[PDB]
């Protein structure tokens, strides 16, 4: 009300309204799902178009051979944060000959987002991210919120109507975690999960976007007729 003019101001109940307003931009964004087994980790994203003449906005960004994310909210902020992740992954490789741990990647994103919430002039990031990866301790899935809070999960979803997909994954937890050495069945479970967040529209060939990373699988993005198999 009077305490939402900038990110440097607490409200009387200890809230940061600019951060909460940034959090709102994510809920307006299109749905994206993340899930994993012990061997692989999968991102599934519902891309959004402006109209029938336009293209569908890309949701998934590759960060390294073993790591990448899906976005929901302001796309330019996802570009800034993914570029930062690309650089940090790259620094780890060049200086230490070491693939960056997914847990450490989350810690770096958290701290980058935080600085924007405590200083005047700047604004919080207006985007949420689902980071998947395969490192020395196996498959990982992270959820990033621009408050700074980063969470490691078996599965999750963010964006509009994301609660539907999140409930499905909460039921399916015991099934999909066991899908080891079978990428197509893990993607099927992700495609079935994102379907619970759909209303009116359905999954078409240029609507759907899938990505996968795993044991002997680099981070690769599937779009177009490459995802027709899963519709």
């Amino acid at each position: 009300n009077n305490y939402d003019g900038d990110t440097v101001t607490f409200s009387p109940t200890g809230r940061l309204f600019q951060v909460e307003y940034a959090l709102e931009a994510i809920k307006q964004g299109s749905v994206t799902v993340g899930l994993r087994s012990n061997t692989h980790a999968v991102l599934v994203a519902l891309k959004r178009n402006a109209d029938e003449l336009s293209s569908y906005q890309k949701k998934i960004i590759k960060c390294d051979e073993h790591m990448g994310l899906s976005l929901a909210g302001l796309a330019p902020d996802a570009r800034v944060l993914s570029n930062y992740l690309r650089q940090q992954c790259n620094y780890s490789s060049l200086v230490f000959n070491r693939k960056l741990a997914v847990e450490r990647a989350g810690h770096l994103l958290c701290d980058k987002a935080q600085k924007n919430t405590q200083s005047y002039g700047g604004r919080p990031y207006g985007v949420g991210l689902l980071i998947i990866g395969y490192d020395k301790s196996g498959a990982h899935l992270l959820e990033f919120q621009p408050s700074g809070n980063v969470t490691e999960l078996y599965g999750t979803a963010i964006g509009a109507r994301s609660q539907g997909a999140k409930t499905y994954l909460e039921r399916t937890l015991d099934t999909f975690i066991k899908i080891d050495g079978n990428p197509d069945e893990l993607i099927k479970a992700g495609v079935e999960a994102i379907s619970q967040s759909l209303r009116d529209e359905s999954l078409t060939v240029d609507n759907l976007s899938i990505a996968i990373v795993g044991k002997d699988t680099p981070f690769t993005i599937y779009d177009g007729e490459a995802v027709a198999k899963y519709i």
Binding site: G14, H107, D111, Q118, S147, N149, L153, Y154, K166
Partner: protein, 243 residues
């Protein structure tokens, strides 16, 4: 009025309302505690299980500084991480120049002065965490608790977050019933009990217990996480006491 809109402004009371508002963020967070024992310190924290989809034991909250200091906090988790990152830089520059690892009182003031600096200007926001920290140095065990104002003191027992009153009551009983002192292994068990008792304030969602400790005898004065059998022994002790 308008005195609460900007950080570093004194109200007619002589108060900085923005700092008091940061305390409300701390009061909103999960419960965390600290227990000073005979030759060391024990830290414990309540981690709320928001969903079944959270991976158990993975979202670690307690943080190490140098190799001998443990830090836990309640409130805005990212603000706590920012403070620990600074703490690590302060401990590194101290060790670089003076060789010896940073003493706990010295380390406490480094955090204290940094938090206090974020109450001096309107261009920055105060920290939205209260931080419980400590460890073992040359002069023995030390436990501290640091508030959004920059205020800190030494403690026999410390508690903050939503369950702090419940925890403070339990800690006060231990101080009265053990004047000669508490052992390190005892303090781990008691820390588990206090977090379980303090969970009645956050009783809707089930939770995950996380403990760490520094002790001269049990860990060679280094910060370690309580894991496996010793963690389960502390959970069983806590589960028995509530029933």
């Amino acid at each position: 009025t308008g005195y609460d809109l900007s950080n570093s402004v004194f109200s007619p009371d002589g108060r900085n309302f923005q700092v008091e508002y940061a305390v409300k963020a701390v009061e909103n967070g999960t419960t965390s505690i600290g227990i000073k024992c005979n030759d060391g310190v024990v830290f414990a924290v309540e981690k709320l299980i928001t969903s079944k989809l959270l991976v158990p034991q993975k979202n670690v909250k307690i943080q190490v500084v140098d190799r001998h200091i443990g830090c836990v906090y309640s409130g805005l988790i990212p603000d706590g991480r920012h403070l620990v990152n600074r703490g690590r830089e302060e401990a590194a520059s101290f060790k670089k120049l003076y060789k010896t690892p940073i003493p706990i009182p010295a380390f406490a003031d480094r955090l204290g002065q940094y938090v206090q600096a974020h109450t001096l200007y309107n261009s920055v926001r105060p920290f939205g965490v209260s931080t419980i920290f400590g460890g073992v140095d040359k002069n023995g065990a030390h436990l501290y608790m640091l508030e959004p104002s920059g205020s800190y003191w030494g403690y026999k027992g410390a508690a903050t977050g939503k369950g702090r009153q419940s925890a403070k009551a339990e800690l006060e009983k231990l101080v009265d019933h053990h004047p000669e002192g508490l052992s390190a292994r005892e303090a781990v068990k008691q820390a588990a009990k206090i977090i379980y008792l303090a969970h009645e304030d956050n009783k809707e969602k089930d939770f995950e217990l996380e403990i760490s400790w520094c002790s001269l005898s049990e860990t060679n004065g280094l910060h370690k996480f309580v894991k496996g059998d010793l963690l389960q022994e502390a959970i069983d002790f806590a589960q028995k006491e509530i029933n």
